[PDB]
Amino acid sequence: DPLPFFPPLYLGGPEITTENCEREPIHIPGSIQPHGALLTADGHSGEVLQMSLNAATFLGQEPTVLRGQTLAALLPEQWPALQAALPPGCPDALQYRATLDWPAAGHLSLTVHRVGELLILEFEPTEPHALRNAMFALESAPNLRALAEVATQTVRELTGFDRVMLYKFAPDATGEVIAEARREGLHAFLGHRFPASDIPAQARALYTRHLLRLTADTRAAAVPLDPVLNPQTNAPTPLGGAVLRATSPMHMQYLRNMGVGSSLSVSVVVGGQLWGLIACHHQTPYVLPPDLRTTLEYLGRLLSLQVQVKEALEH
Amino acid sequence: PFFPPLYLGGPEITTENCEREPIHIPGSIQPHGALLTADGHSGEVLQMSLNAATFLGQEPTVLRGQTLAALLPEQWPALQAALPPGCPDALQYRATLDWPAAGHLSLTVHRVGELLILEFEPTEAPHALRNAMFALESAPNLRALAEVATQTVRELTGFDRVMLYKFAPDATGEVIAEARREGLHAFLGHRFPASDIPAQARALYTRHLLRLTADTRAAAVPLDPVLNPQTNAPTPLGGAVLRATSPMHMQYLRNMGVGSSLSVSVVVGGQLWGLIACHHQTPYVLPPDLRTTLEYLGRLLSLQVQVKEALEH
Ligand SMILES: *C/C=C1/C(=C/c2[nH]c(/C=C3[NH+]=C(/C=C4\NC(=O)C(C=C)=C4C)C(C)=C\3CCC(=O)O)c(CCC(=O)O)c2C)NC(=O)[C@H]1C
Ligand SMILES: *C/C=C1/C(=C/c2[nH]c(/C=C3[NH+]=C(/C=C4\NC(=O)C(C=C)=C4C)C(C)=C\3CCC(=O)O)c(CCC(=O)O)c2C)NC(=O)[C@H]1C
């Protein structure tokens, strides 16, 4: 039965059990994963409102100094570019990316998107023809099976992940592993099927709009935003569009129990519906840098197109 | 059918026999790169472009005996695996060579039956592609998508004019969006008859998605031999981007005052929906890595055109 979200934990909401799966408000956890930092800022003035508690250690500045400046002063070269790329009223799915040379922290990748009147800024550390070669190989795959196999093998070669599966949704939202590339010694998940509650309904809706999410370390504690609520609204900060957003504790326990240290997945979206997932596992924690993740994002789109094409060749 | 090419004493092309020019077998290439053909098994260099000596820095005869194994040691096994016998002519493999005579070359290979076609071009060596991809996806409708696409391509390439040219059901073409330098004519809204892009060129564009003319006044460079030794027949060059452009079509560019021209197929439901069409007033060799960006954009636009057309119908 579909039911509306509970309030999050920090607003006195209940703790999540196997009973109330579908009602966890996973998009507003009030916290991020510790391998990057996040700031929120007023979309018109550029006043800095919220920051992750670890921000001082990524950005090399005291909180009170950060919060006391506008983005115009903090990001003089990027602030006008942000404002042109992310105009008021734009969708929350639109992202702008730049690379910064920050004194204390080396090269940072900056990813920005806009939710209403809020700008959300994510900072992560950042670092030949493999993509072009893959694009052509995907297109020349003769059928859906060969496409799925080429796609899994390519992603594994690009990333070094221990296990890359193509996970396909059935009409009842159960899912099946239809191809996989895996490290020697791992047991096969090919042909296994998994029940619809394994990836509940509000996670699937979010995965139709925001096409990549990850858990770099399945044992890492989440880092709170400070303050936790958006001071504009005294309400929760929407983080569905932020890759740094903390992962559901229910989902992290599910991965730890499987022996997974690091998880990533890309959505494959066909005709406006979530067709499947490029799902990756690693046994140890593992951070895939932003520019490599971009390659996977591009492959997500290519695969969406090629899945349509291969399936049309099939009636 | 097709007329024989000129160099096999076929008729010269007019506006009476537009549909019959064998644009895939011109026997020559554009001079900003070099092409070798080679045997699929032996790696034996069978044809070369008369200009190969320039790019490769090799005494002419040296090449036309040697083997790819010898000539490209690191690459030759990769090719063997990447382009297995029986693969499609559409499948391409690329690498960057740090080659003694020329700082860096791009190498592009595909296979047509028993022949490997190798293309060499100068090359080199950020977020504009990722930023463009998200911009295309958030365009609210087909019109805005067209506008974003043309603007994005112009910004990435510096081309004087970028159009989105859409085919009607009878192959009548319409410029539905345009991004252009100040002080050019506007081709926005104009329609053009189907014969401007003749049937045999639309078919080839459905399979091989990017073509160009780098300089509309440059002479083609012959293949030597012109005929493939294997077959004593013309080498198919339809999947080669270095392939010489139809003089018929180069004349049409010169008459418009264009010095350089590039397009990408937008393919939807197995059919040619439209073209990303680019003009430059002067000669312009777009480097291979930037062309790759446009090739990606072509696929992304193909996806988004279907998405956007579905939310009208
Ligand atoms: C009562 C709640 C439960 C629950 C919740 C939940 N699950 C997700 C997301 C995912 N669950 C996945 C499950 C699988 N992993 C596998 O390897 C296989 C099969 C081989 C299955 C079925 C997967 C893949 C995801 C996607 C994310 C990822 O790839 O790692 C969420 C949302 C997480 C988030 O967005 O932060 C939630 C709340 N899952 C259950 O099984 C029950 C106990
Ligand atoms: C007797 C045949 C004729 C003919 C042949 C021909 N045309 C092409 C390719 C193209 N023609 C194009 C025409 C236009 N360019 C524009 O800018 C506009 C309008 C604003 C039109 C109508 C285009 C866009 C192409 C595609 C290639 C490109 O991007 O430049 C070929 C094929 C050449 C080749 O693939 O090597 C041929 C044989 N064109 C005519 O107009 C008639 C006279």
Curated annotation (Swiss-Prot), chain A:
User: Which modifications occur after translation, per UniProt?
Assistant: Contains one covalently linked tetrapyrrole chromophore. Lacks the cysteine conserved in plant phytochromes (at the position of Met-250) that binds chromophore. An engineered sequence used for X-ray crystallography forms a thioether link to biliverdin through Cys-21. The natural sequence can bind phycocyanobilin and phytochromobilin in vitro, but the identity of the natural chromophore is unknown.
Q: Which domain of life is it from?
A: Bacteria
Q: Where is the PAS domain?
A: 23-91
| Sequence positions that bind a tetrapyrrole | C21
What residues does the GAF domain cover? 143-307
Job of this protein: Photoreceptor which exists in two forms that are reversibly interconvertible by light: the R form that absorbs maximally in the red region of the spectrum and the FR form that absorbs maximally in the far-red region. Also has a slight blue shift for the far-red maximum. Could also absorb green light. May participate in regulating pigment synthesis like the carotenoid deinoxanthin which could protect the bacterium from intense visible light.
The family classification in the record reads: In the N-terminal section; belongs to the phytochrome family.
Its name, as the record gives it, is Bacteriophytochrome
Gene transcribed to yield this protein: bphP
Which span of the parent protein is shown here?
A: 4 to 321 of 755
